[PDB]
Design an enzyme around this catalytic site. Structure first.
Site, short mmCIF file in Angstrom:
data_model
loop_
_atom_site.label_atom_id
_atom_site.label_comp_id
_atom_site.label_asym_id
_atom_site.label_seq_id
_atom_site.Cartn_x
_atom_site.Cartn_y
_atom_site.Cartn_z
N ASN A 23 9.07 -25.47 17.40
CA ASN A 23 8.75 -25.63 15.93
C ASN A 23 7.45 -24.96 15.61
OD1 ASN A 23 10.96 -27.61 16.15
ND2 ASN A 23 9.62 -29.19 15.23
N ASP A 83 11.50 -46.49 13.08
CA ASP A 83 9.85 -46.34 12.74
C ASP A 83 9.78 -46.42 11.29
OD1 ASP A 83 7.60 -45.96 14.06
OD2 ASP A 83 7.41 -43.97 13.13
N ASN A 126 11.24 -34.88 19.25
CA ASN A 126 10.10 -33.98 19.01
C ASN A 126 8.82 -34.42 20.16
OD1 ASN A 126 7.20 -33.30 17.37
ND2 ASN A 126 8.89 -31.72 17.27
N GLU A 160 21.76 -30.48 14.92
CA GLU A 160 20.57 -30.57 15.58
C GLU A 160 20.88 -29.84 16.94
OE1 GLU A 160 17.72 -31.14 14.67
OE2 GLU A 160 17.62 -32.74 13.22
N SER A 172 4.91 -27.83 18.76
CA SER A 172 5.87 -28.96 19.18
C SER A 172 7.05 -28.22 19.70
CB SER A 172 5.78 -30.11 18.60
OG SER A 172 6.62 -30.10 17.65
N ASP A 197 4.46 -25.91 14.49
CA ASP A 197 3.45 -26.51 14.79
C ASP A 197 3.11 -26.55 16.25
OD1 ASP A 197 5.08 -28.50 15.84
OD2 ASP A 197 4.43 -30.06 14.62
N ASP A 220 11.41 -29.40 20.08
CA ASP A 220 12.47 -30.36 20.14
C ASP A 220 13.41 -30.29 21.35
OD1 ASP A 220 11.56 -31.24 17.52
OD2 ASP A 220 12.85 -29.73 16.30
#
Ligand code: CL
Ligand code: NA
Length: 129
Positions: free
Chosen positions: A46, A101, A59, A35, A50, A48, A52
């Site tokens: 990203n 989650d 995120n 990562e 957003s 979209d 990281d």
């Protein structure tokens, strides 16, 4: 801070990530390698919109507030900049929520595509833990 491999392993163990929700330590070191390349200051945008942040590329859509992501839930209740610290406490606390989650470590794309199903124990080889 750019961590050494065993340096990061020792810090993650200190914070209780070894076999947290059943994921051995090597899984967490492997994820951080792919990562962020062990760099606490890593940021990546990203598609979209957003971003990281940090050693575990957490995120901004769901987990932290960076002030520029529509619909941010900020479920770890932190500013994303806090994830870039040389002290990984905030990142580890937040990662514990993420992996709890429901999809486990599949939440980390690099873990799913590059660590899952591999010999992750190699990532802690040689480390005095
Ligand atoms: Cl799981
Ligand atoms: Na958020």
């Amino acid at each position: 801070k750019v961590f050494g491999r065993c340096e990061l392993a020792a810090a993650m163990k200190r914070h209780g990530l070894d076999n947290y929700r059943g994921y051995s330590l090597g899984n967490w070191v492997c994820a951080a390698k792919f990562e962020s390349n062990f760099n606490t200051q890593a940021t990546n945008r990203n598609t979209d919109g957003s971003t990281d942040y940090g050693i575990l590329q957490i995120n901004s859509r769901w987990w932290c507030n960076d002030g520029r992501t529509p619909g941010s839930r900020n479920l770890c209740n932190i500013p994303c900049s806090a994830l870039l610290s040389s002290d990984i406490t905030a990142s580890v606390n937040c990662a514990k929520k993420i992996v709890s989650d429901g999809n486990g470590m599949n939440a980390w794309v690099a873990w799913r595509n590059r660590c899952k199903g591999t010999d992750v124990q190699a990532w802690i080889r040689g480390c005095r833990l």
